[PDB]
Amino acid sequence: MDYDELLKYYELHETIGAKVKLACHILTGEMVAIKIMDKNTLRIKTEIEALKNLRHQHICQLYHVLETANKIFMVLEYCPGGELFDYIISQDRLSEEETRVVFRQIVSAVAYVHSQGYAHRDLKPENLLFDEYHKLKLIDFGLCAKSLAYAAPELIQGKSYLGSEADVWSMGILLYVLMCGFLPFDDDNVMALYKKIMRGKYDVPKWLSPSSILLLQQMLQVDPKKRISMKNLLNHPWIMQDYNYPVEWQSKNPFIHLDDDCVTELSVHHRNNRQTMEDLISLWQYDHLTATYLLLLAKKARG
Numbered sequence: 001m002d003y004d005e006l007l008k009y010y011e012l013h014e015t016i017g018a019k020v021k022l023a024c025h026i027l028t029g030e031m032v033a034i035k036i037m038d039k040n041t042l043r044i045k046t047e048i049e050a051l052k053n054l055r056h057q058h059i060c061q062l063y064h065v066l067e068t069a070n071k072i073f074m075v076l077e078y079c080p081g082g083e084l085f086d087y088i089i090s091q092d093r094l095s096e097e098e099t100r101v102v103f104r105q106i107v108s109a110v111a112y113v114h115s116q117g118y119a120h121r122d123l124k125p126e127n128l129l130f131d132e133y134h135k136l137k138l139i140d141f142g143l144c145a146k147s148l149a150y151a152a153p154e155l156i157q158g159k160s161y162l163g164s165e166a167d168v169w170s171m172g173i174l175l176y177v178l179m180c181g182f183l184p185f186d187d188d189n190v191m192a193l194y195k196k197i198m199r200g201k202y203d204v205p206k207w208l209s210p211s212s213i214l215l216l217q218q219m220l221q222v223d224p225k226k227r228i229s230m231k232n233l234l235n236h237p238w239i240m241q242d243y244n245y246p247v248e249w250q251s252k253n254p255f256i257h258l259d260d261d262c263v264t265e266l267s268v269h270h271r272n273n274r275q276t277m278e279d280l281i282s283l284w285q286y287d288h289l290t291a292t293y294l295l296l297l298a299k300k301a302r303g
């Protein structure tokens with residue numbers, strides 16, 4: 001009963017990870033990742049609402065939501081490059097230059113999330129995946145609003161906070177891990193870790209440049225009001241080094257504009273006219289029609 005409707009649209013492959021299954025969209029032949037959630041074993045509603053309203057080059061795209069009596073299925077953008085967490089480990093640590101390449105992509109996604117009125121609240125390398133073009137995609141918006149090693153001091157303490165300030169702190173931890181390959185605050189004991197985060201003191205390895213050190217101090221402030229704002233992160237001197245242009249955070253992936261080639265390709269599978277087809281896609285119901293349209297756009301982007 002749980003997989004009946006899903007099997008009308010997707011050919012299921014292997015379980016890779018909520019359970020995560022790889023699959024192929026029948027109509028287009030495009031690969032997808034399907035996140036499966038048991039309604040009676042559980043956050044799902046939070047992530048769905050957010051993802052329906054977020055659409056960006058650095059956010060893992062939601063294509064289709066299906067619901068049964070026991071399950072909720074979320075069909076998502078295929079990211080075969082795997083986790084940034086596994087990537088950092090495989091490389092030991094990244095140079096400042098490669099860190100900047102990946103960090104500017106994280107800044108792009110996070111700034112857009114804040115521009116839409118949300119805060120991610122769970123930024124960490126396990127939540128960033130590489131796609132086939134080696135571009136980062138931000139995942140898991142289950143804790144989003146309108147892990148302990150990455151949490152801001154105020155968030156752990158159960159104090160009132162601004163999600164944007166907690167995200168900037170988490171991005172500071174990410175920046176450190178990218179250039180060092182280990183956490184700034186770490187301990188086997190949870191209370192000793194909590195003490196280390198509240199104190200805000202960390203080791204500064206010899207390989208970090210003066211500019212990297214200054215940017216880390218600006219993000220890693222225990223006092224959230226002393227943290228750099230997202231707007232100042234966009235054109236920060238360290239961020240601009242070797243680029244000379246601020247981070248492009250605006251979305252290149254629209255809700256309004258439709259691609260004529262993909263509307264044409266999609267229309268052959270339906271008994272409706274052109275205008276009816278465009279009006280239906282524009283409703284963004286995250287049904288099979290939404291999935292088909294967005295997967296045709298990903299197929300076109302490959303060519």
Ligand SMILES: CC(C)COc1cnccc1-c1cnn(-c2ccc(N3CCN(C)CC3)cc2)c1
Nearest residue numbers: 016017020033060076077078079080082139140
């Ligand atoms: C299981 C976790 C990574 C969580 O995954 C997710 C969580 N929330 C949203 C999206 C995803 C998601 C999106 N794409 N993939 C993914 C796609 C393909 C592959 N392999 C890599 C190696 N290759 C040779 C075979 C295919 C691995 C992972 C997972």
